[PDB]
Amino acid sequence: MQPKLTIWCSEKQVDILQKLGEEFKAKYGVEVEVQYVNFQDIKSKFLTAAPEGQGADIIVGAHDWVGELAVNGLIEPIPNFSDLKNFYETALNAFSYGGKLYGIPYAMEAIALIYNKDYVPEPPKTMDELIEIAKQIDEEFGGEVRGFITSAAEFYYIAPFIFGYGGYVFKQTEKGLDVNDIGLANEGAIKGVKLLKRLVDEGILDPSDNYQIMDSMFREGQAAMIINGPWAIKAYKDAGIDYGVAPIPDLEPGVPARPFVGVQGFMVNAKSPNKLLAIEFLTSFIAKKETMYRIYLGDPRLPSRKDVLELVKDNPDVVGFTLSAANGIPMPNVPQMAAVWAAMNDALNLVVNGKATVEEALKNAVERIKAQIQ
Ligand SMILES: OC[C@H]1O[C@H](O[C@H]2[C@H](O)[C@@H](O)[C@@H](O[C@H]3[C@H](O)[C@@H](O)[C@@H](O)O[C@@H]3CO)O[C@@H]2CO)[C@H](O)[C@@H](O)[C@@H]1O
Numbered sequence: 001m002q003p004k005l006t007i008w009c010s011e012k013q014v015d016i017l018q019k020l021g022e023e024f025k026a027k028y029g030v031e032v033e034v035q036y037v038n039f040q041d042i043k044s045k046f047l048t049a050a051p052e053g054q055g056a057d058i059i060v061g062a063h064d065w066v067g068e069l070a071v072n073g074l075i076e077p078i079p080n081f082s083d084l085k086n087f088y089e090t091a092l093n094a095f096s097y098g099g100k101l102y103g104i105p106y107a108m109e110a111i112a113l114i115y116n117k118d119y120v121p122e123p124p125k126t127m128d129e130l131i132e133i134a135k136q137i138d139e140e141f142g143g144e145v146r147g148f149i150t151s152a153a154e155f156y157y158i159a160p161f162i163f164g165y166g167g168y169v170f171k172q173t174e175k176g177l178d179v180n181d182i183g184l185a186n187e188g189a190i191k192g193v194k195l196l197k198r199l200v201d202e203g204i205l206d207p208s209d210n211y212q213i214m215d216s217m218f219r220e221g222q223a224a225m226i227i228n229g230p231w232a233i234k235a236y237k238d239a240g241i242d243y244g245v246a247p248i249p250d251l252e253p254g255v256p257a258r259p260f261v262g263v264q265g266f267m268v269n270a271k272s273p274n275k276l277l278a279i280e281f282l283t284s285f286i287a288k289k290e291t292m293y294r295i296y297l298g299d300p301r302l303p304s305r306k307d308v309l310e311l312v313k314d315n316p317d318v319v320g321f322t323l324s325a326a327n328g329i330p331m332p333n334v335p336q337m338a339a340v341w342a343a344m345n346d347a348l349n350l351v352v353n354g355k356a357t358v359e360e361a362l363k364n365a366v367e368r369i370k371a372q373i374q
Helices: 014-028 039-052 063-071 082-086 089-094 127-140 155-164 187-201 211-219 230-238 275-286 289-298 306-312 316-326 335-339 341-352 358-373
Strands: 004-009 031-036 058-062 104-109 112-116 146-149 168-173 176-183 223-228 243-246 260-268
Touching: 004 014, 004 039, 004 275, 014 031, 014 275, 014 289, 039 058, 039 063, 058 063, 058 275, 063 260, 063 335, 089 104, 089 260, 104 230, 104 275, 104 289, 104 316, 112 230, 112 316, 127 146, 127 187, 127 223, 146 211, 155 187, 155 260, 155 341, 176 358, 187 341, 187 358, 211 223, 211 230, 230 243, 230 316, 243 316, 260 275, 275 289, 289 306, 335 341, 335 358, 341 358
Parallel strands: 004 031, 004 058, 146 223
Antiparallel strands: 058 260, 104 260, 112 223, 112 243, 168 176
16 A cells, blocks of 8 residues: 655745655655645644644744744654765754754745846845835836835844844853843844834835735836845746845945844654655655755755755855845744744734834833743
């Protein structure tokens, strides 16, 4: 009786994983099923389903999930394998928690300025320049083209401002992250969110702006500049957008934006009776040089396998995202990170809708996070 491996992933990885699964099935007789799940729903769907025996055998996603999923006993440790040496230790460590490896990374990433060269032949070097350019575009195209869009109320996208000015999630110490020392309402975090509010107040961003508006408008030729990640580029290229990638403009002279750095990878369900076969699929096939490069070609980010990064290092997009990631900060993978996102998103929603001062919203966010952690 042929066994089956089911994979959950975002829309970006489906086609390539589907094809690779078909190849694995032809060779080995193992059925492979690739199921789209919206990225924002994967971890919660898995937290719910895995204990009920209805979780996928493999899930694809971001390394910040690892602590939460590892402490809850839902993802399987990955034993050593022949290709381990071929992956950057930084990417492996992102997928490691409590001394064990919990995923096979395929790429790293950070958000950056993506710009449509039809509207902005040369990208802005500072946020002040970006603001002027966006206002010009907004006036000149009289509403049909947005000067600038990002997900205005989503912490992940506003983090580069927060971190740029010296905010932090959990204090980095020589003994590790201090989850009792939260920096998301410190003076730097306030200054970063005040920059967000400035963008809204100057009419550059709208309170309703979110990921879908950003992504669709840019893909459809109706946005000059956005702050988004490498996951979005292939769709833009396929839609015929003449785009470039550059670091987010410096917040002020000599003060760079500092985005989150993420690592994307494959994780195995510890409750799955196919976990051994899932691990084999990942280490013996997914992890190989050609397979990792083919994943890049289907979903181009920053490859985590060293000899694959070497193949793409001169792609202008890789160059741009790399320059952005160089000023960035890896997301924590500790379980407590789960408590951060909703509180901060809610704070930023209050700010961009003029419901609270930056100081009040962020101070309350931090109180909420601490209570949840404790
Ligand atoms: O906002 C909370 C959220 O932040 C982090 O999620 C970000 C991802 O790490 C990042 O990759 C990007 O997600 C994209 C997927 O990679 C891509 O395949 C496709 O599905 O589009 C996604 C963007 O819509 O952006 C998200 C932030 O939206 C963190 O990893 C999450 O755990 C956290 O919940």
